């Protein structure tokens, strides 16, 4: 029943190409980088930390978040593979289950129902019987919605600062003063004193739980 060595090598190397797709659509990465893409907008500096710094920070945060899932996959599936007690097909079947559970717990029921209806799937008895073709796009949709929620909530204190600074500038008759340049250093103050970066990463990690 086991695949031949040539077929196993072909399948492994072929599946190695889907690494960015798996990372974006199956792991936490999508929620993280998107929030960063909004946070740099809230601070008033589109330049912000460089793009690569944010991407790598998101990658490290994603690895830390998926450490339990990676450990469970390593224990349940890949360990018998290395110790010759399982095939490649059975390993692929078994290792996806913890990742499927992780995806399902962050998946909104409405999106899952939408993609079921759109695939004309039969009556799914319980979460355990949800096909991956239905769980993947629904998870991506819920991920986007959650990331937008977090970003909008993040946008609040900087809006407070901008409004207060603009009101102070206008109450003094200084109407011709653009408040963005004045309020940018105070936004940096707010992010520094409250330890914005550490607080935000802790909040993201707790949000995934």
């Amino acid at each position: 029943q086991s695949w031949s060595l040539s077929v196993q090598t072909l399948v492994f190397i072929t599946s190695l190409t889907f690494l960015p797709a798996i990372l974006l659509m199956m792991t936490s990465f999508t929620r993280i980088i998107i929030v960063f893409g909004l946070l740099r907008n809230a601070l008033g500096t589109p330049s912000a930390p460089p793009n690569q710094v944010l991407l790598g920070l998101a990658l490290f945060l994603t690895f830390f978040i998926m450490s339990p899932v990676i450990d469970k996959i390593y224990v349940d599936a890949y360990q018998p593979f290395s110790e010759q007690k399982i095939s490649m097909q059975e390993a692929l079947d078994k290792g996806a289950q913890p990742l499927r559970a992780f995806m399902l717990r962050q998946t909104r029921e409405a999106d899952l129902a939408l993609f079921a209806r759109l695939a004309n799937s039969g009556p799914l008895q319980g979460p355990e019987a949800v096909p991956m073709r239905i769980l993947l796009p629904a998870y991506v949709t819920s991920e986007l919605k959650t990331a937008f929620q977090i970003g909008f909530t993040i946008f609040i204190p900087f809006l407070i600062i901008d409004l207060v600074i603009a009101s102070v500038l206008m109450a003094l008759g200084m109407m011709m003063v653009p408040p963005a340049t004045i309020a940018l250093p105070f936004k940096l103050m707010l992010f520094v004193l409250v330890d914005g970066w550490q607080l935000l990463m802790g909040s993201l990690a707790q949000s995934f739980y």
Partner: protein, 253 residues
Amino acid sequence: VTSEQWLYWLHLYFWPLLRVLALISTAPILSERAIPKRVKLGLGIMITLVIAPSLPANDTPLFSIAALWLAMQQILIGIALGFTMQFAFAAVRTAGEFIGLQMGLSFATFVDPGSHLNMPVLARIMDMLAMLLFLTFNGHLWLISLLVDTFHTLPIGSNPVNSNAFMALARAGGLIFLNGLMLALPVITLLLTLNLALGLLNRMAPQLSIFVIGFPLTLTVGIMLMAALMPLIAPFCEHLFSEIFNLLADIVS
């Protein structure tokens, strides 16, 4: 017979090629993307063909960390030369962008900093004028000659290095600002007076001034002022090039 020792030729032709190509990829005008890559590679190859036989050949193997240290050294020298040269064009671009911003040409930066809406057209004008002047004064030939000359000062072989010297190049970052202020000065000051004059008009009947009369007047005045100021950059252009060149000569050693 029929030896043709290949390692000797490779070690003789490699490191000078690395240094020349490192300068080529960063030196102004020689590093512009409009040149096809093969033209740059061929120019480096031919310059190395001319230069290398006179130099003492090195014998360090390409499969050693010493080769990595050598390659890092050549890259550092080339990028340092090219960047120190680029500093002058950076200064000219700064002066042009500031003249243009005092024109009121891009007012959206004062309200939305870095909002994908900026056109430093005067900066581009004086940048390309500076490139034309640099071409006229044959600065690139000098760059190539100094790239060759840094060997006698600093041979291919791994040599020990210094410190505050790097600061010097970094401290050259001040020049970009310092010289830029002077170029502007010959115009911004009068523009300042013009704005001051507009202020006197606003001290009369309230509103009904600025954003309706100030912008066209100051735009036309800036245009004709710096059109008259154009003949002034060339002595300052030579001053900038001389500053960069003798700073390079003093600090590279």
